[PDB]
Amino acid sequence: DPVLRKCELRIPVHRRPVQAWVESLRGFEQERIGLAELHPDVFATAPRLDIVHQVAIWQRNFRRISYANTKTRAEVSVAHGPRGPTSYYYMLPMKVRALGLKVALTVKLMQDDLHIVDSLELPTADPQYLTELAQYRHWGSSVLLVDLTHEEMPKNVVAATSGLNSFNLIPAVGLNVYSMLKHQTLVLTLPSVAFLEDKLLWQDSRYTPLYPFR
């Protein structure tokens, strides 16, 4: 019985839906179990890698803090030396960051690096099974696992991913461009895709805020 998914939001009439094979991690041979529809405005955006490049630079640089300091000639009991703690923090607009995330999603799907799954549940907690399954499906050396929420993530998956350096387990809210690029292939649960689509599709009619949305 195929698992058939349709986009909750209205897909444009002039744009055909994006589709991919639904997968399950329950068994080694459960590569394809259903067919899902993905919003073109989210999964068929133009591949603007400079935005992704900018986001990656922002990710590396907004956390950058340098603590180098030196004593100048006046402070001797260096003409141009490091002067105390210095930070490089800056903020990208939420529209750009959401767009950058949108662009990244398309690239992985088009490059066959994105694997949409119904759930992360695994028959066993052994880390060996996850690595073997990735080899079974010819996944990349690094596989990223995303779940809807951190609290409810299955215990069996936690043990497998926790012990694996190249396989990292993140919640839906923890998705970021750097992790996707660092990981060769991306594994997403079906609920997470809807969760991501809602926030990404929320950008529609982006009222300029005079106060926090909350």
Binding site: I57, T106, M110
Partner: protein, 102 residues
Amino acid sequence: GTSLDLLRSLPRVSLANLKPSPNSRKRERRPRDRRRGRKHSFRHQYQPLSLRRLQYLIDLGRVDPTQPIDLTQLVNGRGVTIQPLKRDYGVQLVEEGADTFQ
């Protein structure tokens, strides 16, 4: 989307491959070598609403015609912007749209 198809043909992207957009970043000069070596308040600040601006809101259904017009509702619909720091004191109307708002 033929661009998407080209991505599949193209090799898998990596962090190092990322490159800034052309002309996005200018060059800089540093002193490493000789190149940089050597050398009214009382008057109300009325914020008006144009009749043409009024017309589209009704026509677009931004403001319900049945409900009486409320300035707060316009702010709710982001029709007009009022800044307390600007100390806006009044609201007016603009002659524009006198011939287009029936």
